[PDB]
Tab-separated table of C-alpha atoms in Angstrom:
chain	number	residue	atom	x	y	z
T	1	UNK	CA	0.000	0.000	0.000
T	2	UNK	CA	0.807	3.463	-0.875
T	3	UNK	CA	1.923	6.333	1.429
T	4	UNK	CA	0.062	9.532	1.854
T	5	UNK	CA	1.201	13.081	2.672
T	6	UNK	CA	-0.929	15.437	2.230
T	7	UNK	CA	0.880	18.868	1.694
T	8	UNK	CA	-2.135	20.903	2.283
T	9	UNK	CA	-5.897	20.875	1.781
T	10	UNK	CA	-7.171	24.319	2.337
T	11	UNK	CA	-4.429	27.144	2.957
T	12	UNK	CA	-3.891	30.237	4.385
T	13	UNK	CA	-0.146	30.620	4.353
T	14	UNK	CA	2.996	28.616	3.084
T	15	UNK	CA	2.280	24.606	3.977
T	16	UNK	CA	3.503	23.504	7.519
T	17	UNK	CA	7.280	22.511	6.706
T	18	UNK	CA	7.190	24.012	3.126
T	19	UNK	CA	8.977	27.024	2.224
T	20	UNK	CA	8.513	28.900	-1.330
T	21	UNK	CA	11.824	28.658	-3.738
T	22	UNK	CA	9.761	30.075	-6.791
T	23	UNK	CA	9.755	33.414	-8.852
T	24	UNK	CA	8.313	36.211	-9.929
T	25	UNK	CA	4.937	35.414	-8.188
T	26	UNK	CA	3.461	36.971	-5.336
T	27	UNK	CA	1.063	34.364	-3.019
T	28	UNK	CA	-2.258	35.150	-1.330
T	29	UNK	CA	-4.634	33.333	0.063
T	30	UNK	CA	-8.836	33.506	0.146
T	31	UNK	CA	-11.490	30.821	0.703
T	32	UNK	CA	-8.921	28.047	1.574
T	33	UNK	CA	-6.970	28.307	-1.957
T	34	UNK	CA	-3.662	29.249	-2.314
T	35	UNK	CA	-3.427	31.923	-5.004
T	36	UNK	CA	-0.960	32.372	-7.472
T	37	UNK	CA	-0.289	35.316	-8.949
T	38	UNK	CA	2.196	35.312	-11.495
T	39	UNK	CA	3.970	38.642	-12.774
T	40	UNK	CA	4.267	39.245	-16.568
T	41	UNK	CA	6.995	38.586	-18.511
T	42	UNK	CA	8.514	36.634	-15.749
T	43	UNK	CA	7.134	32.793	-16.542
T	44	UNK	CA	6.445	32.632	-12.904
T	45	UNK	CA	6.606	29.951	-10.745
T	46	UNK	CA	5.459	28.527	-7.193
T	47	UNK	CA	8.072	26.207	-6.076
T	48	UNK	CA	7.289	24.817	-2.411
T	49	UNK	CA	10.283	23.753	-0.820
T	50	UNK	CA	10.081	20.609	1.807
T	51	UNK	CA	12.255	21.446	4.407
T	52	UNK	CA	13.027	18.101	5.295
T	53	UNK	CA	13.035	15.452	3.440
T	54	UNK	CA	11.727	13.954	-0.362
T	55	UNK	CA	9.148	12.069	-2.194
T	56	UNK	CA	10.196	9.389	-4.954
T	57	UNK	CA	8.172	8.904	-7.770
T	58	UNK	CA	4.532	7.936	-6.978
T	59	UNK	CA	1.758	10.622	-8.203
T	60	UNK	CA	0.651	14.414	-7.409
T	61	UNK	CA	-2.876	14.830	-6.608
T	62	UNK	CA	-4.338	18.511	-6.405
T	63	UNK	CA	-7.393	20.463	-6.932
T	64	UNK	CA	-6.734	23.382	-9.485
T	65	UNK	CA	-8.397	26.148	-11.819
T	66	UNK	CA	-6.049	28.343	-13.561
T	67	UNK	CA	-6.909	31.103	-16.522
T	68	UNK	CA	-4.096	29.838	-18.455
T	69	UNK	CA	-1.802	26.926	-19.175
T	70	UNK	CA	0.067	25.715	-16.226
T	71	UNK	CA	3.017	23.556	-16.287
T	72	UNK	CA	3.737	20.758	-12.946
T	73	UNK	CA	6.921	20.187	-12.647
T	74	UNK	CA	9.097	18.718	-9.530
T	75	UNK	CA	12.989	19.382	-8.791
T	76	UNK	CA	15.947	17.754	-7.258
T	77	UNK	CA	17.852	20.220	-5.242
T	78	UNK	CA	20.914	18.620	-4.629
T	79	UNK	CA	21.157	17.568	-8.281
T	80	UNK	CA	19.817	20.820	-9.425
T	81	UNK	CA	17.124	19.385	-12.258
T	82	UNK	CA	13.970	19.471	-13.368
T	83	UNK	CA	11.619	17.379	-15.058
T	84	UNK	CA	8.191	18.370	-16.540
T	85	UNK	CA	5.340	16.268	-15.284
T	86	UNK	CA	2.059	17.926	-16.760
T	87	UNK	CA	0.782	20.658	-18.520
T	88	UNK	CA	-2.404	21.656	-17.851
T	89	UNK	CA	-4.900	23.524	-20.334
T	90	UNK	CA	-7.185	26.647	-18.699
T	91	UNK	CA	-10.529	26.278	-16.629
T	92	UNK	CA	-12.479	28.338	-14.806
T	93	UNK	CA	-13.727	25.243	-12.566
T	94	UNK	CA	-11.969	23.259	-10.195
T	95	UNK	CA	-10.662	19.929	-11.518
T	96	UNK	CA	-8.780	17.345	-9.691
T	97	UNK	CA	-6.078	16.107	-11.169
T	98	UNK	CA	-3.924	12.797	-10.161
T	99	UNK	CA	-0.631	12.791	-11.881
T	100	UNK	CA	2.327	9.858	-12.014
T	101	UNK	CA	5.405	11.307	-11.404
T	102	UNK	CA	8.475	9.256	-13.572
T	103	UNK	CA	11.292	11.473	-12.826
T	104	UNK	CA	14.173	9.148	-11.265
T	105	UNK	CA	15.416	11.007	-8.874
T	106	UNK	CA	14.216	12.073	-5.187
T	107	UNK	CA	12.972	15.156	-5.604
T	108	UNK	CA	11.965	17.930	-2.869
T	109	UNK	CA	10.224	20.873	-4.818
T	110	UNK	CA	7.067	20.861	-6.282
T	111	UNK	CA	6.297	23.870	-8.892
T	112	UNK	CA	3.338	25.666	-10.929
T	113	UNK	CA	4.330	27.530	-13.387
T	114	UNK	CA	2.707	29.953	-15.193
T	115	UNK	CA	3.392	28.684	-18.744
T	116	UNK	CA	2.532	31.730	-21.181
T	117	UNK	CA	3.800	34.334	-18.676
T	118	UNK	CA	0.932	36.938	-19.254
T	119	UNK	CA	0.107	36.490	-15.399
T	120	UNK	CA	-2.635	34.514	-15.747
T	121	UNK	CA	-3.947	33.942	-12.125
T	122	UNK	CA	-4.013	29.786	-10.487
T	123	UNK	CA	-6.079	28.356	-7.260
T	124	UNK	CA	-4.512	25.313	-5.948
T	125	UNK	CA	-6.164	23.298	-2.734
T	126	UNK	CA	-6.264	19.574	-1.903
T	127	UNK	CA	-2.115	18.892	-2.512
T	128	UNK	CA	-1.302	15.138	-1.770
T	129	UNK	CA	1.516	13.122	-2.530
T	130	UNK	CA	1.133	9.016	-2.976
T	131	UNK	CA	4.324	6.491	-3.182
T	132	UNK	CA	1.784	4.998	-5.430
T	133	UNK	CA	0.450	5.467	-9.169
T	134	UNK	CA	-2.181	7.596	-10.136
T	135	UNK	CA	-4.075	4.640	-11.570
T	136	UNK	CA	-4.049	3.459	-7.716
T	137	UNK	CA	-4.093	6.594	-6.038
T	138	UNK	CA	-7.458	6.039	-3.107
T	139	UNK	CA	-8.280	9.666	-2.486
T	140	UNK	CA	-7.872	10.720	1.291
T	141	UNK	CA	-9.920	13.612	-0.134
């Protein structure tokens, strides 16, 4: 069976034991969403930083809604690379999304990034991490 962490479900500052490692974004927070808000011209990104420890493989699960194309991505510190795990198209709903994660390294960062850079604005809640795949992936949510 898989391990779950759940990063956060409804926020109103950084995650407990996260810090923030992204760019030209500022964060705020309203009815239990973190908020993105990317700056233009800067392809912004949330990166949120575990302060201790990593997750290997398994899937992402998240709520989202984002005005524009948003790439997932997660990041080896030590190693200093990153590997693409998603991108995901606009909506104005929430959607949950479950996503396998096949980079082969640990990694510690988790990023959203805003793809076109034209500041389109994202809503993330409900972030969960699973050892397991996304085809398995039993929602704690």
């Amino acid at each position: 069976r898989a391990t779950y962490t759940v990063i956060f479900k409804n926020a109103s500052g950084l995650p407990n034991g996260y810090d923030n490692w992204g760019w030209g974004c500022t964060l705020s927070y309203y009815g239990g969403a973190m908020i993105i808000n990317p700056q233009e011209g800067k392809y912004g990104a949330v990166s949120l930083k575990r302060n201790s420890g990593s997750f290997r493989g398994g899937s992402l699960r998240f709520d989202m809604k984002n005005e524009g194309k948003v790439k997932i991505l997660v990041e080896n510190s030590e190693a200093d690379e990153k590997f693409e795990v998603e991108t995901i198209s606009p909506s104005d709903e929430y959607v949950t999304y479950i996503l396998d994660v096949d980079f082969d390294l640990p990694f510690d960062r988790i990023d959203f990034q805003d793809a076109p850079g034209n500041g389109d604005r994202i809503w993330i809640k409900n972030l969960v991490h699973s050892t397991g795949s996304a085809d398995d992936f039993v929602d704690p949510i």
